[PDB]
Design a binder for this molecule. Structure first.
Ligand SMILES: CNc1nc2c(CC[C@H]3O[C@H](OC)[C@H](OC)[C@@H](OC)[C@@H]3OC)c3nc(N)[nH]c(=O)c3cc2[nH]1
Ligand SMILES: CNc1nc2c(CC[C@H]3O[C@H](OC)[C@H](OC)[C@@H](OC)[C@@H]3OC)c3nc(N)[nH]c(=O)c3cc2[nH]1
Ligand SMILES: [Zn+2]
Ligand SMILES: [Zn+2]
Lengths: 341, 341
């Protein structure tokens, strides 16, 4: 396999389905990327850089052979840049041990190099919401300067440049002109993939979709589009309808008794499930999972998490199949009707 | 298969290895019986009657099809009697909902009937330690009267009498004459198996082994011997050396970062494991499990629990094989030398 190749196999409206080929495997898109520590299907997993920086540290991970060996996962891994202050970067103190840490585009790339990830994120600034036009512009402009520094740091590390891929992150808050300037700057630098940053930060689904409507077409069509921090199943479907190819979200693993189902989210702890013999996956019964989680049994939490990860992967498979078959619009309509019934 | 048949295949000293045949499966002995809710090898699992009485209640379990259907386990299940006050039984209030509950030999047998378990424990009184001779005698005498009531209640339930088995529980604290009276009373009533009760209640290993030395030979040789509440791996080995066939213990599942290994227990949270690439099972590394548990990841707890359950089952397999091969004394010596090194 090549270091990085993205190929679009089929399209319906703005939606696309295809593959990213990398040295460690093929990623089918649209893709959901689960947190790698969530459970023992997914073509790529996430490593949480911020956490790994603090425990056990990137140098220790490298000493143990890198994240692939450490976690027992031989397929692609994506890491964030750690930033989610000055022009140089950000400084912060660790609550775990008081140790001092600085983070900059250069240090972020080096941390991700030591972790050994396959998809490396440029170091950006996620602009808070809401933001004034002036503050969104200033933040986006800094992120673009940091994207160039990330590009140069990545290219100066031969093993990384030859074996990994680098994604740039579009910013600009909710402002069309700033999103355009950001897309132009990123395309001029040149990246393997393009993330839509700065969303899922409190703006709500209608506003997020509005921003995606104009923002995704500004990115290079022939490269993957990654919507960071999204999301709920209905967010994913609507974002695919708007041209997004890749997703990450803490929700399936964070979801406390919450299970995702084709009939919407449910809280399995609710007493209405205490005698419900229907399987959670529409074959442990809802009643048994309810019992385990109400009893505080770790098995219940593990089964819930596995159910949610599996639900998300079944959702992505149905999305990919329906786009490839030219019935994604109908799938999206049927999905929403049942999920929100 | 018959309702209940115990056959001894081989012996070494007081140690025995063999099989219990029941309608739902064969149990190889010496056997370790894990808690059924601990994870998704074991020939029999435990159902915790006291917990199930309170949530969701025995009647609700029966409405859901019994414990086998509820838990997805089609092999044998053992339940305790729930008692672990008057001559009639015990009264208590539920902390979960304030509901009132009484427990008696008759009600305990009926609860275990509703749960559908295959091995039913007689309803006894576990005498606290230490106990004076008079109090141990009074408690044991009550337990023997309750054992007869348990026998009669079990026999009056046709489905239970024809398909399940009933174990009696020897009491008598640390006193040889009371242990003898208890064994005689239980054998006169007649049970399918005999438990040694009243141990692992604070007396310490030397005293427990001392009591087992005289107590186990008092039970019928041709029936299984179940040591309740035991125990650590070294407790199991020494109890097998004294004629015990069956074990239950919350330790593998309770063990918080503790892993059982052939080199003794270890606490995987200790910093000395942060860079230790040796597998936990002497193939997740100790370093990765350490990381998961220090990060609070449920995956780490699940992997620890699965490791401990597997360790216990490997221990029991080695015990069974060594008795069958006539090398159990050597195994016990080698086990202790390495476990305590
Ligand atoms: C919820 N809304 C949300 N999350 C955004 C993350 C963080 C992603 C990150 O979010 C957790 O880390 C904190 C996850 O943990 C990470 O997975 C391991 C995940 O990394 C891919 C963004 N990251 C960057 N670098 N830039 C962004 O603009 C951005 C926007 C987000 N919106
Ligand atoms: C620790 N020392 C320990 N545990 C004794 C249990 C309880 C066993 C029970 O102990 C937990 O329940 C509370 C477990 O939870 C149950 O497994 C599901 C387990 O039932 C087999 C005894 N139970 C009875 N009926 N009689 C006993 O004399 C006795 C002695 C024990 N010593
Ligand atoms: Zn499922
Ligand atoms: Zn192991």
């Amino acid at each position: 396999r090549p270091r990085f190749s993205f190929s679009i196999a089929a399209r319906e409206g703005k939606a696309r389905t295809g593959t990213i080929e990398m040295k460690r495997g093929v990623i089918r898109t649209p893709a959901f990327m689960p947190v790698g520590t969530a459970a023992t299907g997914a073509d790529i997993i996430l490593g949480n850089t911020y956490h790994l920086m603090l425990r056990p540290g990137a140098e220790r991970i490298a000493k143990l052979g890198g994240l692939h060996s450490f976690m027992g996962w031989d397929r692609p891994i994506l890491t964030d840049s750690g930033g989610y202050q000055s022009e140089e970067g950000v400084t912060f103190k660790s609550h775990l041990d008081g140790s001092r840490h600085m983070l900059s585009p250069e240090r972020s790339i080096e941390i991700q190099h030591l972790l050994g990830s396959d998809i490396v994120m440029a170091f950006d600034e996620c602009t808070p919401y809401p933001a004034t036009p002036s503050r969104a512009a200033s933040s986006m402009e800094r992120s673009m300067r940091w994207a160039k520094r990330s590009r140069d740091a990545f290219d100066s590390r031969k093993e990384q440049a030859e074996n990994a891929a680098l994604f740039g992150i579009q910013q600009g808050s909710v402002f069309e002109n700033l999103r355009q300037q950001s897309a132009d700057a990123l395309a001029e630098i040149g990246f393997d993939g393009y993330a839509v940053g700065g969303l899922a930060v409190g703006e709500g689904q209608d506003e997020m979709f509005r921003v995606l409507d104009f923002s995704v077409p500004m990115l290079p069509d022939d490269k993957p589009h990654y919507l960071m921090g999204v999301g709920k199943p209905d967010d994913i479907v609507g974002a695919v309808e708007r041209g997004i190819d890749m997703f990450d979200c803490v929700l399936p693993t964070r979801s406390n008794g919450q299970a995702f189902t084709w009939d919407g989210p449910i809280n399995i702890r609710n007493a209405r499930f205490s005698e419900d013999l229907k399987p959670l996956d529409s074959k442990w019964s809802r009643a048994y999972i309810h019992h385990l989680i109400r009893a505080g049994e770790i098995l219940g939490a593990m089964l819930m998490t596995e159910h949610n990860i599996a639900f998300y992967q079944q959702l992505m498979q149905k999305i990919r199949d329906s786009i490839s078959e030219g019935r994604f619009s109908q799938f999206a309509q049927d999905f929403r009707a049942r999920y929100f019934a």
